Design a protein around this ligand. Sequence first.
Ligand SMILES: Nc1ncnc2c1ncn2[C@@H]1O[C@H](COP(=O)(O)OP(=O)(O)O)[C@@H](O)[C@H]1O
Ligand SMILES: Nc1ncnc2c1ncn2[C@@H]1O[C@H](COP(=O)(O)OP(=O)(O)O)[C@@H](O)[C@H]1O
Ligand SMILES: Nc1ncnc2c1ncn2[C@@H]1O[C@H](COP(=O)(O)OP(=O)(O)O)[C@@H](O)[C@H]1O
Ligand SMILES: [Mg+2]
Ligand SMILES: [Mg+2]
Ligand SMILES: [Mg+2]
Lengths: 371, 371, 371
Amino acid sequence: TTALVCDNGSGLVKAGFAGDDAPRAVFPSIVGRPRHQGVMVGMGQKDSYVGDEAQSKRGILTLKYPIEHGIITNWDDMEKIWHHTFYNELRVAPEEHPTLLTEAPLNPKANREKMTQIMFETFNVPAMYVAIQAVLSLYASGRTTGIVLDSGDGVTHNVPIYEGYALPHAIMRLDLAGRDLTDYLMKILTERGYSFVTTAEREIVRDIKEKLCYVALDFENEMATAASSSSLEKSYELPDGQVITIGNERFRCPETLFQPSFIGMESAGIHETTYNSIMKCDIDIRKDLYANNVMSGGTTMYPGIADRMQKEITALAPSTMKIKIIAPPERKYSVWIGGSILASLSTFQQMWITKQEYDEAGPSIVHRKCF
Amino acid sequence: TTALVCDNGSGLVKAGFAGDDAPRAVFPSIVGRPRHQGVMVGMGQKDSYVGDEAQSKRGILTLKYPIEHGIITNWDDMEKIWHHTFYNELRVAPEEHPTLLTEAPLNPKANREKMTQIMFETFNVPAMYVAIQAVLSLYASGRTTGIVLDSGDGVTHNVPIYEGYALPHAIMRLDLAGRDLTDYLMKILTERGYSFVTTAEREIVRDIKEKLCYVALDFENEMATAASSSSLEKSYELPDGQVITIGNERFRCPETLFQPSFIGMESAGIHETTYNSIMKCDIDIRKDLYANNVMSGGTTMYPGIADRMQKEITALAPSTMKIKIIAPPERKYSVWIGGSILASLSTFQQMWITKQEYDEAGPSIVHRKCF
Amino acid sequence: TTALVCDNGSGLVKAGFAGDDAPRAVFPSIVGRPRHQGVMVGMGQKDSYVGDEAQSKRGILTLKYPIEHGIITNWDDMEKIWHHTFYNELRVAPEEHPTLLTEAPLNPKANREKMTQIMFETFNVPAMYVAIQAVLSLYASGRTTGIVLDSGDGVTHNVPIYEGYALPHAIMRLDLAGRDLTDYLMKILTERGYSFVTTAEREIVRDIKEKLCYVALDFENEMATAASSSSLEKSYELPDGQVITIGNERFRCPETLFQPSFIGMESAGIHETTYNSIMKCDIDIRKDLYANNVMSGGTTMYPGIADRMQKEITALAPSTMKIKIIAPPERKYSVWIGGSILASLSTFQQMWITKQEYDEAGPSIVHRKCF
Ligand SMILES: Nc1ncnc2c1ncn2[C@@H]1O[C@H](COP(=O)(O)OP(=O)(O)O)[C@@H](O)[C@H]1O
Ligand SMILES: Nc1ncnc2c1ncn2[C@@H]1O[C@H](COP(=O)(O)OP(=O)(O)O)[C@@H](O)[C@H]1O
Ligand SMILES: Nc1ncnc2c1ncn2[C@@H]1O[C@H](COP(=O)(O)OP(=O)(O)O)[C@@H](O)[C@H]1O
Ligand SMILES: [Mg+2]
Ligand SMILES: [Mg+2]
Ligand SMILES: [Mg+2]
C-alpha cells in the first residue's frame, strides 16, 4: 500500500503519495463560516467552507486558522481539514494507506497525543508516524550533516544534526514566522493611509508581502536610499482596482526576522539564534555545521535573505572558517519531499506505529516510538 | 392548493397565481368617491369606486391612493383594494390559497404587522409570507449575486447581495419615485400655461409622463440643444380634444432622479447612492457587484436610463472595472415574476407562516419567520 | 507668553490657554453652506458658516464635517475652523503664543505633516507640539500606569502606558466612535416611521442620542424588560414641533460598541479590545494595567458604561485580579486638560518645535521631536 505524507503545516496543508516528488495538492488551512444573513431560499447552503473554496469566497466569511504557532489550538476545525484533504482532495480511503505527519520540536505532548488519537480512531489509518520537520528537510537535501533553519508560518527552529545524530540540547525554537510578519506589515501600512482590518484583509496584506517584500542586505543603506528618492516604490492592485504604493515598508517588514524589537520581542535575530545554536554543540563538530546551513520552510523565500544571513553570521563566527548558506530551490516543500523520501525506504518500514500497537499500548506510545 | 402572489405596489396592484409568467390582474391602486350631487333617480349609487371602474369615471370623483411612499396610510381602503383583487379580478375566495405579499426594506414594523393581521383575521388565508421586493427582483433574473435597484412608484431602494448573502448595512433606500416626478412635471408644465390642478388631471399628467418623458444622456447639452432648436418638442392630445406640446420638460422631469435638489431633497442621485451602497460592501466582492447591477420597477422604464447609469457609475468607479447594467425587457413585473418563481420552490414550502402559528404567537411572528 | 492648547476634536473643538482649569472656548467642528437661493438684498449673506453659528441656522445649510475618523479629509475647511478659533473664540493672534495640538495614534503620517506645515506657514506660531491623545488622557488624571480607553467621535483606541514607558506594539485603534452610533440610531429610528434624511437632522438624532441613550448592563435582560413593559419608553420633542417616542432604541444604540456586528463590522467590542491590549504586554506589568483602566472621550459618558466595562472585563481577566475603572466626571475634556498640564511643566520647554528648527528641517521634524 502506497503511503501518504500529510504535512499539516501551520499555514498550508501539503499532501501527496509516497514515492512521488511533489505534493498532489496544496491549499491554505482555513475554515471559513459565513458572517451575514442568507435571504435566498434554496441557496447559500454548506454552512461551512474549507480550503480553497473558503479562500476565494472570503468576502462573506470569517477565516480561522486552527494552528497558532505550530500548535493546533482548535480541534474541530483540524478534523474538518483532515477529512477534506483525505477525501475531497486526495480522493482515497484513509483506512488502507499509511500516513506520515510532521510536527515541530518542543511541542506540548498532548498535541501529538491527540493527533495520533484522531488519526487512529476517526480515520482508521492502518499506520502512522510523527517525524520532526528539520530532519525531513535534511533528507530532502540528501545529507547526513548540517544545521537546519526551517521557518514556516507559525514557528522558526534550528536543529543541528551530525551524521544522523541529533543534539537536542542545542535545538532552539523561536516563535516568529510569516504570520507575525504579515501582522506587522498590516500595521505599518497605515502610515501611508491604507486600513486593513478584517480577517479577510489579512489575506490581501499577505499577498502584498508575498509579492513585493524583500530582505535588505544593508538595512541602514536601504533606508538612506529609500529616503533619497522613490526608486524603491512599487504599486499593487487591490481586489477593487484601487492601487496602493509602498516604499521602505518592503524591507522594513522582513527586517523583523533579524531584529524582533520591531514587533516588540526580546528574542534575538535568526542569525544570532543559529550562531548560538552552533556554539552550544561539541567543539569538534562545529566545523561541519558552520559549513552546512540548510534552509527550509516558506518564510525563507524573501529575496536577499541568504546574502544577508551569510554576511551577518560571518560577522560573528571565527574569521578563518567558512560559512556556506545552502538554499535548495524548492525549499518551500523540503519537509514534504523528505517525507516522501523517508516513506520510500525499505529500512524505515519497520518503524511504523501499527494499529495493533496503538490498541495494545494506547496513545502514549507515540512518545516512545517517535523522536 | 395553489398560492397567490399579490405585489401590492404603490401605483399598480399586480396579482396572480404562482407558476404563471405574468400577472393575472393589473389595476391601479386608487379608490374614488363622488364629489357631486346625485339628482338622478335610482342611478349613481355605490358611493365608492375602486380601480379601473374608478379611473374611467374620474370626471366626477376624488381619487385617493391608499398607499403613500410605501407605508400604508389608510387601511380602510387597502382592504377595499384587496377585496377587489380577490373577488373581481382573480375571482377566487382567498380562504383556500396561501398568499405572498411584499414590503420595501426599512419600512416600519407596524406596517407589515398590521398587514399580517388584516390578511389572517379578515380574509383568513391558510398561510402567507412577506418577501422583500429586491430579493424577488433578483430571483426573476435567476441570478445569485448583484446589487438590486428597485425604483417603484413611491420608493427607490438598493439591496446589495453577494452569493445570496445580503448586507443590511448597505441597504440604502431613497423615497423619491414616480409620484414625486409626476408632481414635478405638473409643476413645470405651468411654464406654458397648462394648469393641471385636480387628481384626474394628475392621472392625465401621469400618462403624459409615461408616454413622452425620457432620460437625458448629457443634461447640459440637451438643455442647450432644446433651447436652441425645436428638434425635441412633441405633442399629445387631451381627453377633450385640446392638443398640448412639451419641450425640455421631457428630460427635465426624469433628470430629477439624478438631482433630487430639483425638488428640494438633499440626498444624492441614484448613481451616487448605488456607488455608496457598493462601497460599503467588502472589498472582496465589489468587483462582482460592479458587473451585476440589476434594475427593476416601472420608473426605470425610461428610454436610455441604463445608458445614464452606465455613464455615471463608470465615471465614479475605479477605471479597471466592468460596469454592466442588467435591464431585462420585462422589468416592469420583475418583482411579481420573482414572486411567482419563489412560491414554486419545494424548499420554500417550509417558509410559510401558517394560520395556527399566527394564532399562537401573534402578529410579531413576521419579524421572526420572514426577512 | 501663555501657550494655547487647541485639542483638535473630530466633533467638538476644545480650545483654551495653558494653566487654566478647562477650555475657554468649545464649539462644534462643522462648516456649513446654504443650499437654497437668496431673495432679499442685504440678507442671507456670507455663504459659509462655521461651528455654532452654522448649528444655529442649519435649516438652510448643508453641514460638512472636515474630519472623518480623526483624519482631516477637508483641509480647506479645517483651515477655516482654526482661523475661527484663533481669531474669534480666543481672540488672540496665534503668532505670539506656542500652540500645543493633539493627534490620535496609528494615524497616517502625511496628516500630521501637513498639520504642522499649515501651523508654521499660515499662522507662523513661534513653536508647537503634537502630542498623542492617550498620553494626555493619562496626564490629566495624574497617574503613570494605565491603559486609556479613549472613545471619541472618530476613533476608539487603547494605549497601555507603564511607569511612563509606552508599549507601542500593544496600542490598538478601532474606527468606531460616536458618529457611527448616531448613524445606526438614525437608521433604527425608521423602525417606527420617523425619517431623518438630511444633514440638518443628523444633529437632531445626535441630540436625541446624547439625551436619551444609555448602555445596558445585561443586553438581553434589558431587551426583555423593554418588550414586557413600557417603563423604558421615553418621549422627545423635535424642533419642528412634533413629538417622538423611543422604546428599546435607547440601549440598542450604544450596544454597537460591545457587538460591532450590528453595524456590519467584524472587529471585537471595546472590552475585548482592552483585554487584548493588556494581554499583548509583558507578563509582570498586567497586574498594574488591570488596576488603572482610565476612560475618556465623550462617547464614554453613556450612563452605565464604566460599570459595563468593569463587569465585562472581569469575565476575561482571571478571577484573582483587581480590575478597576477610573471614570472622572470631567473625562470629556481629559485630553485638553492633560495638554494644559503638560504645557505648564518647566521640563517641557526644550522639546518644543521652534520656527527656526522647522525652517532648517521642514515638516519631517515632527516624527523626530514627538511620539
Ligand atoms: N514566495 C514567498 N515569499 C515570501 N514568503 C512566502 C512565499 N511563499 C510562502 N511565503 C510565506 O510562507 C508562509 C506559508 O508557507 P509555509 O512556510 O510553507 O507554511 P507551512 O510550512 O507551515 O506550511 C506564509 O506566511 C507566507 O508568508
Ligand atoms: N413606460 C414608463 N415610463 C415612465 N414611467 C413609467 C412607465 N411605466 C410606469 N411608469 C411609472 O412607474 C409607476 C408605476 O410603476 P410600478 O412598478 O408598478 O410601481 P410599484 O412599486 O407600486 O409597483 C407609475 O407611477 C408610472 O409613473
Ligand atoms: N453625554 C454624552 N453622551 C453620549 N454621547 C455624547 C455625550 N457627549 C458627547 N457625546 C458624543 O460624543 C461626541 C463628542 O464627544 P468628543 O469626545 O469630544 O469627540 P472628539 O474627541 O472627536 O472631539 C459627539 O458625537 C457626541 O454625540
Ligand atoms: Mg513547515
Ligand atoms: Mg417596486
Ligand atoms: Mg478625542
